[PDB]
Write a structure and sequence with these properties.
Number of strands: 0
Largest sheet: none
Number of domains: 1
Order of helices and strands: HH
Structural class: mainly alpha
Shape: rod-shaped
Radius of gyration: 18 Å
């Protein structure tokens, strides 16, 4: 009534795919910020597009960390 490896793995796998979709979307977010950086923008604008870009890279950074831990867990 405790050891259920298949169950355990479907739960982890779902966590992994969802994590990968987040990384993909965050990566998308960054490529669009780049585009946004090429346009006609002030300096407050350029300033914040760069802060966001930094937040998304850090976000992606953790998620790849988690991804590692999740893959450890499997089984």
């Amino acid at each position: 009534s405790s050891r259920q490896p298949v169950y355990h793995n479907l739960t982890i796998e779902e966590n992994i795919i969802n994590l990968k979709q987040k990384i993909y979307d965050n990566a998308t977010k960054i490529t669009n910020i780049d585009k946004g950086l090429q346009g006609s923008i002030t300096d407050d604008q350029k300033e914040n597009l760069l802060k966001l870009k930094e937040n998304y890279k850090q976000l992606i950074d953790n998620q790849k960390e988690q991804l590692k831990t999740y893959k450890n867990l499997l089984n």
